[PDB]
Each structure stands twice: as structure tokens, then as C-alpha cells.
Curated annotation (Swiss-Prot):
Glycans are attached at S32, N413, N472, N611. Transferrins are iron binding transport proteins which can bind two Fe(3+) ions in association with the binding of an anion, usually bicarbonate. It is responsible for the transport of iron from sites of absorption and heme degradation to those of storage and utilization. Serum transferrin may also have a further role in stimulating cell proliferation. (Microbial infection) Serves as an iron source for Neisseria species, which capture the protein and extract its iron for their own use. Monomer. Part of a complex composed of SLC40A1/ferroportin, TF/transferrin and HEPH/hephaestin that transfers iron from cells to transferrin. Belongs to the transferrin family. This is Serotransferrin. Residues 6-328, 342-664 form the Transferrin-like domain. Keywords: Disease variant, Disulfide bond, Glycoprotein, Ion transport, Iron, Iron transport, Metal-binding, Methylation, Phosphoprotein, Repeat, Secreted, Signal, Transport. Fe(3+) 1 binds at D63, Y95, Y188, H249. One of its GO terms (cellular component) is plasma membrane.
Length: 679
């Protein structure tokens, strides 16, 4: 072990004093092979951000506004440790900015113009920056000076700390706009009282503000929340009806070489020795020198930020949109009004080439973005860099936990009424070679497995779910001797059978030849003992239908299916010999893009679907015909979902529990990140 010092950045002489006490008390209880603190004193939060980027410091705790500023070039900082504020069993790392109104006041979010508004204070986050950022494009021009545009948007307001001389209407509800607690409508409790008293029609406040100023649910039922989709929901449903979800206080560090593990090691040790009510000699969350030095006085401890989290993901799509609007002070030109370009997310260069062709044929209505993993693509849809992609049910689940919604299903059964007929799903199966007569589902231990990719339905969740129920541990790489399960940790025995070159080895994309249904079947033919795939994989790749050299000579009847009862059946007897049902793949998008995506794709499939006779020369959306590029190759159409518009309602209770039973065996860094934000 070499250097274990975290250089903490302080922003004032008082912080610098507390940091020094922090270093001293840690040196007295932590041994020499443990973490230590060093203190660098700067003059502002921005100077700390700059110093960290320039490798002169390592850590500083920031409000969300500065976490945003810290992420921008050329700082490139990321969140690494979170302060939490509730119980250790119910940590409250985030608040929810909300718009509270009285029940039955008869207006939605898109009708806030002409209303009386209550704010916590000018330039405050929940009470100003967030709602004003979100309303920005609805404000009348000129939008700056901002206070003037807002004063013209609302009929009257309380905005503490605002200039009452230049902008009198901002003070109508609190004459003088007193920047202090002597004003009854100042701050969180004050802005809520402004609403409670009938002075304002809407208060912009934290979700916690309501819960701490009202005794009861009966009290809370007298109020409502404004949702971004122009509906109202009960106050208790703030998780589903907020303006933005916002981290309270975040330790940030360099994106590269930032010492995140050491920063957590330090802070995890500090909260154990000197955290809430732990020590009398030193307190992490108080000080004789003042409030909120280094960390907030209301903090109860720290939680580690999941590694896959970047600032955009951490702050959330809603918060980023608001702050960008305010920071750059410029609007895209309304109306216009048009949905047009859906940005499709393609998985690496193989999918990107089919997507490119689609884009040119769609004539402006489809555009393309690339990422190297499904999870990177899902992250791109979350942050707004992409809008849609099709997904295996396993990744529909992950996407759903990440707040995405299914809009249309891939359908596989040919029918005169494809678009309007929901399918129960395909079958997950375990394929083996007939000549390998020994193999039974009863004992697959010490054998070699081939999987579409980790996290996928037929390739992973179903069979590994069933395996986990039998052996009751997650070490599937010890159960099997070796295999190919693309997406596995690189030193895992479940990467040893994969065929990709160099850095492509075991990657979950088509640069890895054993990725996906066809690839998993190839793996079985060449190296493996069992393949976990869909029921149609074998016939799609046998009898000369796959013309590639490895598949050319393969016969359907040389393969069998493993049944659950320990017997074997031929390939076409999948209906009586399968592991489980598998919900169809589906297109997912942001809740705010659901309608435009639904519209565009229905139009798109009408032009490039199954209606096209000659698929040579004309563009076909549903053909690869080997690698399931963009959509599965056996896709007949994209089907309506009607009310099956959430991941839980789409996938069904049966498959949702199954994946949840595997929650402990999850290597998915994206899922860890999403469930940290929404547990
Ligand atoms: C699709 O497949 C199922 C089961 O194989 C079959 O019963 C059904 O008739 C097919 N048609 C439709 C429209 O789902
Ligand atoms: O609103 C602000 O500007 C102050 N801080 C936190 C605080 O001081 O409570 C940002 C926030 O509320 O996220
Ligand atoms: Bi605040
Ligand atoms: Fe699948």
C-alpha cells in the first residue's frame, strides 16, 4: 500500500479549522494502514471544484446546483459519497421538489399563469430554481431580467429576498419580500404557510415540508400535487408526482483517478467513530465553530454512491433540464409543433449500420446513437441522449426500475391481426447435443454453459433463477466448470468459452461472436454442453437457413431440449419441454416521449414491416437475419400495449417475482444505481 491521504477541500477558515480537527481525531483512532485526511483551504465552492480537477485536492461536499457545475467541462467531477438524513434503515439521500396546491382548486401545471405563487426564497432550489427552470419556456419574453418575467407570469407572489422596488408583484403576498424568518412566508415552512393561509394558490417546496407541517394523512388529503403530465395526485404519491428528485449533499471527486474507494473508506470509518452520537470528543455533523461545516448538521451518515452513477444520472433528467434552462437562459423555438426525430439507440457498430440505413429511409423521422452495452444505451435514454430501443424482458425490467416505460411489444406469432393481439410470450429452453446422451437438468454441475448474455430472459434470468433456487448461492461460475455468458466479470470462468478478440472477449455485443441467441447456439455447437436460448433458435439456425460456415451443415434433429422433470425432448416439442414462459421483447422510452415514439414507430412499421414483398432492394426493419439487429429477426410486428404500460404490468407478476428472486445475484451496475435513486 502507498498513499492513503484524502485531500479535503475547505471553503472558509471555520471549515479549515474543523477539517484540521477531523484529521487529528482520525489519526488518533485509525491505524497507519488506514485512511487519513489533509486539509486544503480555498475561498469558494468553485475554487474547490477547480482544485479537485487539477489534482490539487480530492473531495468536497456539494449542494446539487454545484454538483451540476462540477460535472461540466473542464472539471468533469462525479458524485461518490452521499449524505443521508433519516434512519439507517430508511436513508433519505434525496428530496423531491414539488408543487403543492389545495384540493379542488381546479387547475393543472399547464395553468400556473395568473395564479398566486409561494416561494421559499429567490435563487433557492425547490422554491425557485427548479420550478422556474421548468416553467422557463412558458415565461413571456424577454425572459431576463428573470424576476420581471416571473412577475408577469404569476398574478402575485411571495418571493423572499427579491427586489420589491423593481418587481412589486413578487411581494404582493409578503410585503417587502423579507429575506429573513421575521417574514411569516419565508423558507420551507413559510412558503407552505403561504398556501395553508389561502394567500397563495401554489407553494413550491420540498416533499418533506408538507409531511413536517401536517400532522396526518387526513390533513394531507386536503392538499394535492401538481404532476408534470398535467394531472394531480395525492401528496403521499410524491415519488410519482414531483418536479425533480434532488440529492441533498454529495461528495464529489475526479471521474478518472479520483480516489473514490479511499474517500468512502475514510468517510465510512469517520461515521463509525465520529458520526451521529458516536463520540463525545469529536463530531462529524456538528461544530463549536458553526453550522454545516463540511457536511450538514442534519446528516445522519454516509452512503456509497454506486460506481455506474455519473452526475447526469445522479441528479436526474428532470433536475438537469430545469438547471440548464436557467444557466444558459435560452429557449428552443416553440411550437413548432412536431414530434419528428426519435433517437434510436444502437448497440455498437453492427446495429449502428442497420440503424443508419433506417434513418435515411425514414426521411428525418428516425436518428441514431450508439453505445457498447445495452446498459449504456439504457442510461442514454434516461439522460436524453437517446429516446428508444427494443429490449429483452430482462432489460425491460432494469429499464423500468430506471424509470423507463414499455410502449410497444415485438410480436412473433404470424396473424391477420398482429398489431392488436397480445402474445403470452416465447419459451426459454435448455438445448443440448443429442450425442451427449448423459446430460439432464437434474445435474448440470461441472458442465459448460452458453448464455445469450447476463441479465437476459432465456439466456440468464430464467435458468439461473431456477439454478439459484436449487443450490442457493450466486456463484454460478463455480457451479459450471466454464462457459460463455457475455457481460460477466472479465476474470470469471463464464467468460472462458467466449470467442471475441482482445477487448471484445465476453463483451455483451456482436463484436463477441457468442453474444445473443444465435451466438449462444454457436457456443453450444463449438465449445459448450448446454445453451440457454429461445424455443425458435435451433430451427432458425439449422437446415441451411443460417448460411454461415459454422451453421451450414447443422441439422435440427441433432439437438434436444432438457425438460424440468429430468427428461429430454426433440426441439419442436418446446411446448411440453421448456424452462419457462418469456415476455416478448419490447421498445422502451421516457414517459415524456411515450406518445411520439408510439406514433412514429406505427408509421415506420407500416412502411418497412411485413407488407413489403421483395425484401431485397427495399429496406426491411425486421431482418438481420442472423444477429437480431435492432429487433429480433422473428419479429412479425410491433404491437399495441394498451394499459400494459409499466414494466410490472407488461412483464406480468410471474416474471417480476422470478427476477426479484435473483436480486441478490445481480452484477448489474446500472440496476444498483437506479435502485439507489428509487428503492
Ligand atoms: C400464437 O401462438 C400461440 C401458441 O403457440 C397459438 O396458440 C396462437 O394461436 C398463435 N396466434 C396468436 C394470434 O397469438
Ligand atoms: O436551496 C438552496 O439553495 C440551498 N441548498 C440546500 C439547503 O440549504 O437546504 C440547495 C437545496 O435545497 O438543494
Ligand atoms: Bi434549500
Ligand atoms: Fe429474449
Amino acid at each position: 500500500v502507498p498513499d492513503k491521504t484524502v485531500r479535503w477541500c475547505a471553503v472558509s477558515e471555520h471549515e479549515a479549522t474543523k477539517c484540521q480537527s477531523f484529521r487529528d481525531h482520525m489519526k488518533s483512532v485509525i491505524p497507519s494502514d488506514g485512511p487519513s485526511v489533509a486539509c486544503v483551504k480555498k475561498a469558494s465552492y468553485l475554487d474547490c471544484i477547480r482544485a479537485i480537477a487539477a489534482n490539487e485536492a480530492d473531495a468536497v461536499t456539494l449542494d446539487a446546483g454545484l454538483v451540476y457545475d462540477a460535472y461540466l467541462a473542464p472539471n468533469n467531477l462525479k458524485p461518490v459519497v452521499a449524505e443521508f438524513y433519516g434512519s439507517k434503515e430508511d436513508p433519505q439521500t434525496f428530496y423531491y421538489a414539488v408543487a403543492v396546491v389545495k384540493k379542488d382548486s381546479g387547475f393543472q401545471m399547464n395553468q400556473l399563469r395568473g395564479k398566486k405563487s409561494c416561494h421559499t426564497g429567490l435563487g433557492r432550489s425547490a422554491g425557485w430554481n427548479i420550478p422556474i427552470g421548468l416553467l422557463y419556456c412558458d415565461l413571456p419574453e424577454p425572459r431576463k431580467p428573470l424576476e420581471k418575467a416571473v412577475a408577469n407570469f404569476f398574478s402575485g407572489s411571495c418571493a423572499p429576498c427579491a427586489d420589491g422596488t423593481d418587481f412589486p408583484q413578487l411581494c404582493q403576498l409578503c410585503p417587502g419580500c423579507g429575506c429573513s424568518t421575521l417574514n411569516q412566508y419565508f423558507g420551507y415552512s413559510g412558503a407552505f404557510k403561504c398556501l395553508k393561509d389561502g394567500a397563495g394558490d401554489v407553494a413550491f417546496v420540498k416533499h418533506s415540508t408538507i409531511f413536517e407541517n401536517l400532522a396526518n394523512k387526513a390533513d394531507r388529503d386536503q392538499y394535492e400535487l401538481l404532476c408534470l403530465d398535467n394531472t394531480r395526485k395525492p401528496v403521499d404519491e410524491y415519488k410519482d408526482c414531483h418536479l425533480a428528485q434532488v440529492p441533498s449533499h454529495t461528495v464529489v471527486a475526479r471521474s478518472m483517478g479520483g480516489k473514490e474507494d479511499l474517500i468512502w473508506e475514510l468517510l465510512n470509518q469517520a461515521q463509525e467513530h465520529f458520526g451521529k452520537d458516536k463520540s463525545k470528543e469529536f463530531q462529524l455533523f456538528s461544530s463549536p465553530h458553526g453550522k454545516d461545516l463540511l457536511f450538514k448538521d442534519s446528516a445522519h451518515g454516509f452512503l456509497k454512491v454506486p460506481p455506474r452513477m455519473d452526475a447526469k444520472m445522479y441528479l436526474g433528467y428532470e433536475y438537469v433540464t430545469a438547471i440548464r434552462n436557467l444557466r444558459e437562459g435560452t429557449c428552443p423555438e416553440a411550437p413548432t409543433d412536431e414530434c419528428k426525430p426519435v433517437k434510436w439507440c444502437a448497440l455498437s457498430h453492427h446495429e449502428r449500420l442497420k440503424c443508419d440505413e433506417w434513418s435515411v429511409n425514414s426521411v428525418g423521422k428516425i436518428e441514431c446513437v450508439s453505445a457498447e452495452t445495452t446498459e449504456d444505451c439504457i442510461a442514454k435514454i434516461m439522460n436524453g441522449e437517446a429516446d428508444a430501443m427494443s429490449l429483452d424482458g430482462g432489460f425491460v425490467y432494469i429499464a423500468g426500475k430506471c424509470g423507463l416505460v414499455p410502449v410497444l411489444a415485438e410480436n412473433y406469432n404470424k396473424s391477420d391481426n398482429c398489431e392488436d393481439t397480445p402474445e403470452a410470450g416465447y419459451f426459454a429452453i435448455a438445448v443440448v447435443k443429442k450425442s451427449a446422451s448423459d446430460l439432464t437438468w437434474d445435474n448440470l454441475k461441472g458442465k459448460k454453459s452458453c448464455h445469450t448474455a447476463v441479465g437476459r430472459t432465456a439466456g440468464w434470468n430464467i435458468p439461473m433463477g431456477l439454478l439459484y433456487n436449487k443450490i442457493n448461492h450466486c456463484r454460478f461460475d463455480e457451479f459450471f466448470s466454464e462457459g460463455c455468458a457475455p457481460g460477466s466479470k472479465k476474470d470469471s470462468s463464464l467468460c472462458k468459452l467466449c470467442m471475441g478478440s482482445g477487448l471484445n472477449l465476453c463483451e455483451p455485443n456482436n463484436k463477441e461472436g457468442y453474444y445473443g441467441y444465435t451466438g449462444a447456439f454457436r457456443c453450444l455447437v463449438e465449445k459448450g454442453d448446454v445453451a440457454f436460448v429461445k424455443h425458435q433458435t435451433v430451427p432458425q439456425n439449422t437446415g441451411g437457413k443460417n448460411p454461415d460456415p459454422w451453421a451450414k451443415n447443422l441439422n435440427e434433429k441433432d439437438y434436444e431440449l432438457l425438460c424440468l422433470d429430468g427428461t429430454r425432448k426433440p426441439v419442436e416439442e418446446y411446448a411440453n419441454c421448456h424452462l419457462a414462459r418469456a415476455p416478448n421483447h419490447a421498445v422502451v422510452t421516457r414517459k415524456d416521449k411515450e406518445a411520439c415514439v408510439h406514433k412514429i414507430l406505427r408509421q415506420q412499421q407500416h412502411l418497412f414491416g411485413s407488407n413489403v414483398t421483395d425484401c431485397s432492394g427495399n429496406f426491411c426493419l425486421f431482418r438481420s437475419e442472423t444477429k437480431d439487429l435492432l429487433f429480433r429477426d422473428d419479429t412479425v410486428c410491433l404491437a399495441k400495449l394498451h394499459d400494459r404500460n409499466t414494466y410490472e404490468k407488461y412483464l406480468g407478476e410471474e416474471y417480476v417475482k422470478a427476477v426479484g428472486n435473483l436480486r441478490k445475484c445481480s452484477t448489474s451496475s446500472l440496476l444498483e444505481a437506479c435502485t439507489f435513486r428509487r428503492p
